[PDB]
Amino acid sequence: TTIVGVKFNNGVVIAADTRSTQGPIVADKNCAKLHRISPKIWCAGAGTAADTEAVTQLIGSNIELHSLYTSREPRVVSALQMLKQHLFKYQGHIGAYLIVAGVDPTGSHLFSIHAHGSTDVGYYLSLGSGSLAAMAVLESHWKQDLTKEEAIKLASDAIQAGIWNDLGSGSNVDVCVMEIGKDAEYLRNYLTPNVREEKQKSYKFPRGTTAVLKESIVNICD
Amino acid sequence: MDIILGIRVQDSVILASSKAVTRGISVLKDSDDKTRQLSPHTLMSFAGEAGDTVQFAEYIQANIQLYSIREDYELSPQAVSSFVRQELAKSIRSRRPYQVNVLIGGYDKKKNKPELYQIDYLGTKVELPYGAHGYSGFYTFSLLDHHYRPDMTTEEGLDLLKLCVQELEKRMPMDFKGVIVKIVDKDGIRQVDDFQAQ
Amino acid sequence: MDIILGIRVQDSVILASSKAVTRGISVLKDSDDKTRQLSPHTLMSFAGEAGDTVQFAEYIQANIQLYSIREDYELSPQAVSSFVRQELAKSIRSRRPYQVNVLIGGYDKKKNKPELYQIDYLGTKVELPYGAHGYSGFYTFSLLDHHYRPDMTTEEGLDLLKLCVQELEKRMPMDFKGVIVKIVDKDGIRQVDDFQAQ
Amino acid sequence: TTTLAFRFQGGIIVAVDSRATAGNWVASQTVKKVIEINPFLLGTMAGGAADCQFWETWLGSQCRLHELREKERISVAAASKILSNLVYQYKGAGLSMGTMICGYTRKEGPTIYYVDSDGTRLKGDIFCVGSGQTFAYGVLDSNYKWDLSVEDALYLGKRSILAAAHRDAYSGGSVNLYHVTEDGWIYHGNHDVGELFWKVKEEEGSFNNVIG
Amino acid sequence: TQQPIVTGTSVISMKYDNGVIIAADNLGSYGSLLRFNGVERLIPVGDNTVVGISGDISDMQHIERLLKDLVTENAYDNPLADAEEALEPSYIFEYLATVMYQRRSKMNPLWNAIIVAGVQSNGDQFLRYVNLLGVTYSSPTLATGFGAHMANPLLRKVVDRESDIPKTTVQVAEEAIVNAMRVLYYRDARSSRNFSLAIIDKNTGLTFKKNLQVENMKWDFAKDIKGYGTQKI
Amino acid sequence: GYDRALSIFSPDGHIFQVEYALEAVKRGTCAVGVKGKNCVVLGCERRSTLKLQDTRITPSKVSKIDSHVVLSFSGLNADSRILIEKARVEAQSHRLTLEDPVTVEYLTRYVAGVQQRYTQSGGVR
Amino acid sequence: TSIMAVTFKDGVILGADSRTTTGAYIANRVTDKLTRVHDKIWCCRSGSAADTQAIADIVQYHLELYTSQYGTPSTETAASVFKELCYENKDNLTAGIIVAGYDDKNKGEVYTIPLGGSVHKLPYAIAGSGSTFIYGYCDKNFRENMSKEETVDFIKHSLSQAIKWDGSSGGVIRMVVLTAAGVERLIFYPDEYEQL
Amino acid sequence: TSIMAVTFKDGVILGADSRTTTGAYIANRVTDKLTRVHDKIWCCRSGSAADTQAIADIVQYHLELYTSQYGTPSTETAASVFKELCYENKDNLTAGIIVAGYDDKNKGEVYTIPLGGSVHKLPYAIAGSGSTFIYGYCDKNFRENMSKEETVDFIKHSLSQAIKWDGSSGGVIRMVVLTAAGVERLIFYPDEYEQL
Amino acid sequence: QFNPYGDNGGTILGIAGEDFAVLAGDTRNITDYSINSRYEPKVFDCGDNIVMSANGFAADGDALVKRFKNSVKWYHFDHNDKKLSINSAARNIQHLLYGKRFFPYYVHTIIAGLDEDGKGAVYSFDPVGSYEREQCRAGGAAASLIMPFLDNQVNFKNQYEPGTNGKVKKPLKYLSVEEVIKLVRDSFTSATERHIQVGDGLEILIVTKDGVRKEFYELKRD
Amino acid sequence: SDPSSINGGIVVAMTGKDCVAIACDLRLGSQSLGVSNKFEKIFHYGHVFLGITGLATDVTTLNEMFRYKTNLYKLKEERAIEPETFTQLVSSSLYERRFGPYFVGPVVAGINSKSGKPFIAGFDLIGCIDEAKDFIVSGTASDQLFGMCESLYEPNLEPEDLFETISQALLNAADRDALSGWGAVVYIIKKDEVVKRYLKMRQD
């Protein structure tokens, strides 16, 4: 997995690859690693997939309930505090590593959280097995005061570094832009540089090829 | 382990269970009945860990008898087996699981058909024409896979077991001191006191 | 382990040895002769580790036969036993020791007296009225401690073994598939082909 | 793996399966587990593929040298002991093999020897070796008679391996048959379990459980 | 079997149109202690080959001695030692690879990752890697340790496949390598700012640059970062 | 350490040491063997250079290699022992591995090989 | 990590490097190890980031509720809370914390809570992997009552050395000045401290 | 243990503490860690006493036979012998040796052979458990070409600090001065260096 | 503690035609989650019309190939330049492998060529020398994904004559070099999709009575 | 040792044109010993189908559980649960046992009764959802199934064709796995009808 976060002059963007894997086998060639905590707080996660997904929804759920209770927009620091205290409580057993970003009444934010519960703040971050390939790119092109477009490029380029150079990463690039004044825009499959070439042959079998022993109708209606 | 075999013929279920109880270097008893009657038409054989074995059997026996008196009715073999599977399935994830394997043979008076259920200590249940627990299965499954027929009479079934028991007495390393055979059919449960030479 | 018994009566030494050869889950053979004749009046029974067992027996056999031909004479039972002890005592401190236990029964033509030697794989030798290796000793030493007499005839000796073998077939966990009995006396070594029911 | 060999009136029957595995992975369904040491000596193979193939092929080379040296066909006993003694030299090193040396000499007649990597060497009339041995024993033991027909014996053997291929997850593929008479071994075909099972089921009425 | 004590980090390299470039910082680490700073880890052999070594420094010094001997020995009864019969980069590599595999095969490895860079006599660029396991491979770009994770992605953006070599100039190449060295300085905790770089060009020969330093580093944005989440001052 | 070539060819193609070895046999007491239709008999003569021996203990001329094979000889007595011992050991080794006593031709082929080997090995006569 | 706190004439200063690693990889090169638990009570964190962050967050909470009820807390009290958490939970924590605050009655104070959970009040304190290398240097150059400028210099030099030898330390040098005047953030980049 | 070698204008000086421990017990408080392998080639031993002693004894032997045949050996050659033994037998040795000699052509030279068996030529070198504490101090106070008196002072201070912080070091501070003038033994007691 | 082995990924495939045979393999070589090379040949022409690949631990595979080639060389020197038949090479390889029975060449090796009747032949080996001649065989990382495919598409397993009620098995008509190359390419594009250690490039060596020919095809680089 | 390798078994699901297919083998063994060749691993609640590979006792327990939950769902919701919804119910139910999971590999297949759209999904033992449009695989011969599916599969196959493809994938993958096979059943599902067929395969 390769997930990144890049702050720009008026917001923040997060991106991620789309390869899911069990050991060396690719289970999902196009999963979505970008999760929504609240409409404008998005999260990307690496590590135990079920954990990043469960922790994201749990905190997301409480963030919604909190927002309704306080009649205010969710704040990134709240998702951060709730996530970390939860992960900390479980001493690292909830293998969730996340890069959480978003905009709220106080501005734009970019944070990272580790399974044990420590948090970081910065202008550009990357996590996952592609972490290094991506960070190499970010360390070579990041600059202060990037435009929304420059940020998308930088982020998109980082995820690519991962897709190509990291075996734990591949397929497509999903992006999500969060600009201080507008709605957050999720760009599912913003890039798709790995389309399978047309197969050399068709393996459609002649009907009757398979030997059947018994046949019957199944009752679905009650 | 101990020998726990079961075979469902035409109108009945036959259960053969070894008579030995060995602890370490000594064979403490040679007339052990590794079975408990759960209801007039349901019999259960068991083998496994020293204490868990009987404690479990008697526990299940008690519950079925309680059900029988409360409802003045006899749960079908399928129902009793489902209850036992769930009990073992709870057990496997508890502090100290019951390490017991069982065969449940019962005659379903409502369907008028014999039934044989095999359930291991993990709560793995499967209904079979014939079953076995432990090392026995290794020499009796192919035997029965060969000499078994659905329409066999109770008598052909007993001959079949005898054949199993002989294979077990030839190739098995342990002396399980023979078996105790019991028949479950439309008329209840009876024991074949003459298998020591049938 | 296997059953290796030996009993020295009035004018002979009787050696009883189990016939089973079990590997894991299967009893591969039920007519195994766990003995090697070292010389016309010296017999050796053995039990232990799978390969070491026979390899050792035959190795000792070969050496004794070589001695016999070189000297045109038969080493006394005491001498043959001392040679075997030293062989095992060397073995215990080598790269891979022979894990073999043995009973050496021989008739000493010069003294005109039967002799029984028990030697374990460490090279521990002791001369006895009766001996056993493995778990057997646990049920046969007190038996013999009770029913044994120095003046017993070869016939009383065979009755004594039968008594041992019966105790072993009642309390031992394993099915050793009976024993092969051999008599060593002033006239050599002969086998009692009828012990399966004597 | 499942392999058997048994002595009867018409000589010796030798049957083996042909599956090879590495864990749950079925590496092969077409492996030869019977090496024809020579016109009158067969060797069955069970355990590590390499260990068997290598050492038994080597055994053959040793038998050939015996014949050039003694101007006489090696005895089943002497041939089996070569392997046994070799395997014993390596005791403890990790060789893994359960083998059967089957042959026919004028001097010994039909003869079978069990030889494993533990160093155990046994002469007998019936032997089943391999992860599926118990399954074979169950079928073979309950239908064996010294007086079977070369036709029936062949079948029991074939049927015994079938039984094992069915119940043992580590046995399968096809059955390779052999008949041993003083004029040497006679190959009796390679029967794919894939078709043999159904045929036997129908014609015999057994395997009554499985649905067809 | 052993364990490394004093060590050297990454060795990055790539090949351009006329030759190959290889670099390595001058640090000799001892666990987390940045103990030595005057450690040259680029071993020049003759004038057409440069050997970059990472891993156990004591083993590196040994490999160094081996190389000096290979040179001395090749000169024996060799009137063409400085011409047709001079040490080729491929010879030097096959030698070292032979040694590496023999040692791992005797269960007593030379705890290193080595990259042999150079130009063959027929002008061909030579770049191959060998480590303590005896494993070997070639690629338009090669890096060891940390450089494999961070340098390769950057360098492969300049030369992704073979066809990109002729299109790459010494300047573009040397620039990519120098930027990589900076990146590694940012994220590799066992790296040094000072490093050596060497170019082996089929025309200009062997250029060995010493005492370089990572420059143009961005650190200013650090001032704007306070706390680890909710802190504002 | 000592490996001088003692048995070597001479100009006419003879190995003098082997030839002189035969002269040692010519000097030894006579020995004979005739095979019947169901037996083989071995006769040997007894010297008389000195008579006052103890025939009970004095080593006999006919030796048993195994229970079904015998070996008589003519020549150096001390030398015969070496061959007899090796023959006896090989006899047992053969029973141990082939599980069958040696054939007379086999046991013979073996003794002969030991003798042959001593004609082209260094340091030995 | 390399962190330290130094008391001086006008109050106290806290300094730290900015490198956090996970193995040999630099997970963050601009970390801010100077954490505020109260207006004029800060701390330096070493050990498990997850643990020290959780610790600090709890402490900040306690001093905030304390202030609500009893006014501004003494630096001694802040150090007591850290201690209570570190000592009582010593089996599950890997935290080495330097506490430094500025009071008006007590001027500057420095307390160090090492691994066990013990508390030690000192003129100045150094800690973190890189600290081992500057024990000699700091012992030889520390003087009580130095001037702000002198103190900033002492910390700047000491840490530059720690960063020089310890690979677990590096990046920028951050400082926090605590005096009656208020709170001042200071930073120093490699190009400056590397050449001292 | 805390030992060091420093090259200076007139040659080189070797210094060391005198404490050898087996656990927390001081087996010897007056140990002489300054070992002579040749007239003007000495070394400082750290690690296994048994190993370093055996090493040195072998080296002394080699330099003695070398001298018999080829005259006085260069300090570089002595360091090569130590290396040969330490590298080739790295699996069975726990030795950290500082080699320092005075030649007429090369003046003073210092070589350090750490655990692996690698060799490093340096202006000066520090080693031993106590050395970690004086890395910062020594880096900040070492100057090339110091005078004998300045060098003795540098070593005296550096070690006094090492001894101050490392419990595995202590006792007296021993020194050996190697110059064209000859060889001079120096000693300094606690009462003096403890108050520096 | 030192581990003498490593896993360099990759997958190889060998199919035998009626008068030809192929040995294919991706050109990617990896270590953990990094790519060492996108092009590092792994299938070799060893002379006497024999191609071989020893997949698994590269250093081991290389030493084996190297040893076998040197074997062929000496075979000529010692048997009047006689050609080494494929069956003979197979036996020779068995000894090479088994010679290291107690410190194995951690590789799954396959060789391809033509037998003495001109028929296509494929031989595959156990890490310690076990071997069998076959019609086709996949080896290496994706072996478990490809073999099932080859059982179905090369030996028509589980395939029957439509309408024969699974009573008649699909006839064993034999594949042409063109049909075979399609199966190979499809096998690798499929493998490349689901296995993170397969990709970059595919190189196939074709053996006919005229010698050894090579074809190369790109593969997804993610 | 490995709960997921004790009993053996596989399950695979594929989408087709206005149809879906879910198939499984019939084996249930204890290590090498084959025990039952009637152990089906596909179940259904309403029009939603669920296949489960892994530890047999958990396969059974989970089935009894989802029947229990889907029954109450119908009584309250007054409508049969949909594929999408059920997938979520399966996921949360698994994650609820995060630190003491059921050792299973579930697979959901069905047609949304309201949108007619075909649906399939897979899960790891702690509930992580894998939502593929083409095919989901599970079991001891999953590597094989991945290889077979990736090669044999192609979009919008018709019911009669998807049947051939799925059966060929299951069958050939099962035949390279010692713990799978011993019978097999395939389910062809369409908005209105569902056909169930038992395949003929090797019994070794």
Coordinates of C-alpha atoms in Angstrom, one line a residue, chain A residues 19 21 23-29 129 163-171 193-203 205-212, chain I residues 28 30 32-35 38 145 149 152-153 158-163 165-166 179 181-183 185-186 189-190 192-197 218-222:
Chain A
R19 CA -3.9 -3.0 -4.7
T21 CA -3.0 -8.3 -1.1
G23 CA 0.7 -12.6 1.1
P24 CA 2.1 -12.4 -2.4
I25 CA -1.3 -12.8 -4.1
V26 CA -3.4 -9.8 -5.2
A27 CA -6.9 -10.3 -3.8
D28 CA -8.4 -7.0 -5.0
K29 CA -6.9 -5.3 -8.1
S129 CA 5.1 -0.5 2.0
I163 CA 2.8 1.5 -7.8
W164 CA 5.9 0.9 -10.0
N165 CA 8.6 0.4 -7.4
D166 CA 6.8 -1.4 -4.6
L167 CA 5.4 -4.9 -4.9
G168 CA 3.0 -4.2 -2.1
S169 CA 1.4 -1.6 -4.3
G170 CA -0.1 -1.2 -7.8
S171 CA -3.0 -0.6 -10.1
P193 CA -2.0 3.2 -15.8
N194 CA -2.4 -0.6 -15.5
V195 CA -5.1 -1.9 -17.8
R196 CA -4.7 -5.6 -18.6
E197 CA -3.9 -6.2 -22.3
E198 CA -6.4 -8.1 -24.3
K199 CA -6.0 -11.8 -23.8
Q200 CA -4.4 -13.9 -26.6
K201 CA -7.4 -16.3 -26.7
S202 CA -10.9 -16.8 -25.4
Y203 CA -11.5 -19.6 -23.0
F205 CA -16.1 -23.5 -23.2
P206 CA -18.4 -25.4 -25.6
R207 CA -21.6 -26.0 -23.7
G208 CA -21.7 -29.6 -22.4
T209 CA -18.0 -29.6 -21.7
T210 CA -18.7 -30.2 -17.9
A211 CA -20.0 -33.5 -16.7
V212 CA -23.1 -33.1 -14.5
Chain I
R28 CA 11.7 -9.8 -13.0
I30 CA 13.0 -9.4 -6.6
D32 CA 11.0 -8.9 -0.4
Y33 CA 9.0 -6.0 -1.7
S34 CA 11.7 -4.4 -4.0
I35 CA 12.6 -5.1 -7.6
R38 CA 13.1 -5.7 -14.5
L145 CA -1.8 -20.3 -10.3
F149 CA -4.6 -23.8 -16.1
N152 CA -7.1 -27.8 -18.3
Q153 CA -5.7 -26.1 -21.5
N158 CA -12.2 -32.1 -16.7
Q159 CA -13.2 -31.5 -20.3
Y160 CA -15.6 -33.7 -22.2
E161 CA -17.4 -34.1 -25.5
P162 CA -20.5 -31.9 -25.3
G163 CA -23.7 -34.0 -25.2
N165 CA -23.1 -36.8 -20.9
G166 CA -19.5 -36.5 -19.6
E179 CA -1.3 -22.3 -30.0
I181 CA 2.7 -19.5 -27.4
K182 CA -0.8 -18.1 -26.8
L183 CA -1.2 -20.3 -23.7
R185 CA 1.4 -15.4 -22.9
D186 CA -2.0 -15.7 -21.3
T189 CA -0.5 -12.0 -18.1
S190 CA -2.8 -13.9 -15.7
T192 CA 1.2 -11.0 -13.5
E193 CA -2.3 -9.9 -12.5
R194 CA -2.5 -11.9 -9.3
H195 CA 1.0 -12.4 -8.2
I196 CA 3.1 -9.5 -7.0
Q197 CA 6.4 -11.2 -7.8
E218 CA 6.5 -6.8 -22.1
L219 CA 4.4 -7.4 -19.0
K220 CA 2.8 -5.0 -16.5
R221 CA 5.5 -3.3 -14.5
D222 CA 3.5 -2.7 -11.3

